[PDB]
Amino acid sequence: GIPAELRPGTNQFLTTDDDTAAPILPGFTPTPTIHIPGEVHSLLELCRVETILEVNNTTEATGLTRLLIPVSSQNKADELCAAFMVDPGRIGPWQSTLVGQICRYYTQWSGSLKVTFMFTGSFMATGKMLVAYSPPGSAQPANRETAMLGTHVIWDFGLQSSVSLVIPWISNTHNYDYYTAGVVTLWYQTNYVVPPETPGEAYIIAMGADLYKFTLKICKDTDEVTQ
């Protein structure tokens, strides 16, 4: 026949190798396909769906109460409310999102994010909050003045009920911890103002998502599953 030479790699099974396997049941035609709605062509479709950050993670909160950011009328203007890192792939309050869970399947990510704050008060409650982002390489701001000297939003929840803050760029390369973080904080610009005979306590809900600029690489397996 045709002269040939076997070569290194002969008779080995590589698990990632794309090759042909013999059909064991030829002449079999599977069931024809139909149109099922909601087909998914990428995991990036699932990153971009904003899901609830659990910012209240504490030994003192149990149920849905870990998904709620408390805002009351006892607090005084100029003082902090909540602070959390922007790190979808680390241990903290990104671990309840989808971005958080998908990042566990990849070694590197990068792109931009979006964080949405949603105020649930009474219709007649009013006030302002300062939603600020300190970039990586700096500690969280010490007071409102230094939070106001950087990227931020003044959000009056008497007028507007929901506010979004785009984080311009984040990256995790990758047991020295290579991700230098950067933080979102919440400040009281005013004091929460309340009319007579209405609760005077409300909750903020936080959400997070990836913008279309976000990407992922170097597949792996999640640290959550043990087996």
Partner 1 sequence: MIETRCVVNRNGVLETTINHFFSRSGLVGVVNLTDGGTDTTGYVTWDIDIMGFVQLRRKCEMFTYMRFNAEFTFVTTTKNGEARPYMLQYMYVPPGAPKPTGRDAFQWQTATNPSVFVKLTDPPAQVSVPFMSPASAYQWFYDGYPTFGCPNNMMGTFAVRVVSREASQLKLQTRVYMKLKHVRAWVPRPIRSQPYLLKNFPNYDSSKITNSARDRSSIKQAN
Partner 2 sequence: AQLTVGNSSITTQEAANIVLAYGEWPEYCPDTDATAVDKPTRPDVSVNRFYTLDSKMWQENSTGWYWKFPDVLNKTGVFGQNAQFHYLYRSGFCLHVQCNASKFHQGALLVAVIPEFVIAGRGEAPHPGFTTTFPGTTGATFHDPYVLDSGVPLSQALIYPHQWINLRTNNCATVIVPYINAVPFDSAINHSNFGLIVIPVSPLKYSSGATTAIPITITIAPLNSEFGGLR
- The binding site for a second copy (CB under 8 A) comprises 1-11, 13-14, 16-26, 28-29, 217-218
Cβ nearer to a second copy, comparing 24 with 36: 24
Q: Does 139 bind partner 1 (CB under 8 A)?
A: yes
Q: Does 193 bind partner 1 (CB under 8 A)?
A: no
Least distance (Å) from partner 2 to the CB of residue 39? 9
Q: Does 169 bind partner 2 (CB under 8 A)?
A: yes
Residue 48 carries which DSSP code?
Answer: S
Q: Does 43 bind partner 2 (CB under 8 A)?
A: no
> Which of 116, 140, 151, 191 is in the footprint of partner 1 by CB under 8 A?
140
In Å, what is the CA distance from 199 to each residue of 59, 203, 204? Answer: 26, 11, 15
Q: Does 41 bind partner 2 (CB under 8 A)?
A: no
- Which residues fall within 8 angstroms of residue 214, CB to CB, at 6 or more apart? 44, 47, 48, 99, 109, 110, 111, 112, 113
Q: Does 34 bind partner 1 (CB under 8 A)?
A: yes
5 makes contact, choosing from partner 2, partner 1, a second copy, none, with CB < 5 to 8 Å by partner type, with: a second copy
Q: In the beta sheet, which residues pair with residue 186? A: 82, 131
- Which residues fall within 8 angstroms of residue 159, CB to CB, at 6 or more apart? none
- Piece in contact with partner 2 (CB under 8 A), picked from 4-12, 76-84, 205-213, 218-226: 205-213
Sole residue written with tokens 């990036």: 44
Q: By C-alpha distance, which of 86, 84, 94, 87 is closest to 186?
A: 84
